Curated annotation (Swiss-Prot), chains A, B:
Homodimer. The capsid proteins form dimers that assemble by group of 5. Twelve such pentamers are linked together with free dimers. The homodimers binds to the viral RNA via an operator hairpin, but also to many other RNA sequences in the viral genome; this interaction probably shifts the virus from the replicative to the assembly phase and ensures specific encapsidation of the viral genome. One of its GO terms (molecular function) is identical protein binding. The keyword RNA-binding applies. Belongs to the Leviviricetes capsid protein family. Its main location: virion. Changing W77R: Complete loss of viral assembly. Capsid protein self-assembles to form an icosahedral capsid with a T=3 symmetry, about 26 nm in diameter, and consisting of 89 capsid proteins dimers (178 capsid proteins). Involved in viral genome encapsidation through the interaction between a capsid protein dimer and the multiple packaging signals present in the RNA genome. The capsid also contains 1 copy of the A2 maturation protein. Acts as a translational repressor of viral replicase synthesis late in infection. This latter function is the result of capsid protein interaction with an RNA hairpin which contains the replicase ribosome-binding site. The lineage of its organism: Viruses, Riboviria, Orthornavirae, Lenarviricota, Leviviricetes. Gene3D superfamilies: MS2 Viral Coat Protein. It comes from Escherichia phage MS2. GO terms for cellular component: T=3 icosahedral viral capsid. This is Capsid protein. GO terms for biological process: negative regulation of viral translation; regulation of translation. InterPro entries: Levivir_coat, Phage_RNA-type_capsid.
């Protein structure tokens, strides 16, 4: 019943895929990392908590490294995703499924926001 | 050249789809909303700015309403997504495309985090 | 594809209309100007923001110039002798449907329609009594 | 001979027109009301005063109610849209100058133009 | 129909021209950049506002990077800051004249662009 | 000396505005179209070490609206108003002459006819 499992973070077609695997759990925070050394690893974390009388709040983070040798194995830099999702306690399973779909549609290929990010440009 | 365009936020198969359309732009914040009344609308915003000498930072928000009549047309409640993505200025187009894919893989159907959200449960 | 477009501010029957054209956009404020020099231009601005949890608020401004020529030494500059300033604030609750908003627009139109008291009073620069 | 008269605020083509009628005058403020109960009424006010040595200032207000019944049933406005208009006219303005100012206000809000179209969609100009 | 469009910043004769394209707009500031990564990009910004009762002020910035033809970086950057004040009384012809003054200032063969291009002062 | 007269406003060989060297003091080179200064176009240029690694050019241009004002009851040459350009250019000390030539071309392309920014200025409008 444990949903703390390995998954594909970057799908490149079965070959060259970036998988992240469970590596730590502490204080409600589940952690995935792609591989050692951690300096060069993709990182994913997730936690959820009661943020108010009427809301649940997920905090989800992803770190995407630029992998370079500089001679330490290091990330030349990191892109950081910080995601917060608040869901009211009145939400049904269907409500939550709808919310997931909204998040997916937001970032689907060809849509404005992911297209802008992909070009490191703004919406105008 | 304006990327401020209407798109599908919730894909339900061509019928019953939730589309959001451009409705406002102010202070670097682009806004989409599905329809009037706004009290019941899906909402999407996006802005991006220089957060440090070396980073660009996107702030992306989505509001998913639970549409109910209570007699005001209202949202019984709202789920709020607050998304922050920091990208270093050294990032190429390919780097940014990779980051988008990481975000997509994070939320793909069947993966741990979207599955947990869909059940309003935690990772354990 | 944007609604930031030129329009007729003073309709004089299609001839010698006062048109205002898009000229600036900053901090959510759209600006139209009739022509250069700006000193003699009609100006229109529009902005809207969330003013409270339950209200959107439009701020609309119009400047009508009295167009003169400013002569001092024997130096002429194109100027407005003076300006009339309209400041319009409209709050619309987030519960408003398309029909609600259309109705609000009609109320504004009816307020200022020819022959009705308030525009008649303004046209005579007199009060309502 | 007084200009404080009833008029059509919302012209719907002779059926369900919203007329507002004189109902109050105090401290220079003329008020029109559509009907009782006031809780559900369209309301219009107008006043004008010398705002500076060289300017007069009109303050014109309109309230558009959303007419509901909130349930003990009260006749109420579920909400109200509030228009506040301030118009300053210099004392040098002729009759013609003032007629021009009115026309500018009218053209601003004419059907099909950007600003009334944006309001009608509860959207911004961008 | 918007004037926020891509243009040639450095004309090299159709071969290795430096083009800059719209990339951001916020708080009245239009931004162009040549390409990603931004670390190596040419950058252009433009904004304009009422600076006084009778004047409007354009603020124009250009960044020229030194970029080779390992982290992608600029070996260094040159910064242009331009401020132009135009009175509200200026006609179309007046504004066109002001632009021409700016163009003549920097035209090939003229003293100031010749001095800059030669890494020298005028004295 | 590179301190020479040039055409500031090219009107096509007809009523061109030239500015000629008129002053040098405290590192500032000055050109003016003609006397009296009340009606003159003016250009100044100076350069200095602004930091350990940068030289900084400070370039100013004044465009007058040229009128004639009559004062009891003589006609004075005046500017009805003035447009002011203040231009600052920072160049790192590592830049070669070729690098500097490239920077100049960038400034030229910035302001070339038909491009957005000079088009916006010419209409006294913004970029949007």
């Amino acid at each position: 019943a444990s949903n703390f499992t390995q998954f594909v973070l970057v799908d490149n077609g079965g070959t060259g895929d970036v998988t992240v695997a469970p590596s730590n759990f502490a204080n409600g925070v589940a952690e995935w990392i792609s591989s050692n050394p951690r300096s060069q690893a993709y990182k994913v974390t997730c936690s959820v908590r009661q943020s108010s009388a009427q809301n649940r709040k997920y905090t989800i983070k992803v770190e995407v490294p630029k992998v370079a040798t500089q001679e330490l194995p290091v990330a030349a830099w990191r892109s950081y995703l910080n995601m917060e999702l608040t869901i009211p306690i009145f939400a049904t399973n269907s409500d939550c499924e709808l919310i997931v779909k909204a998040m997916q549609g937001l970032l689907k290929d060809g849509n404005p926001i992911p297209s802008a990010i992909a070009a490191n440009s703004g919406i105008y």
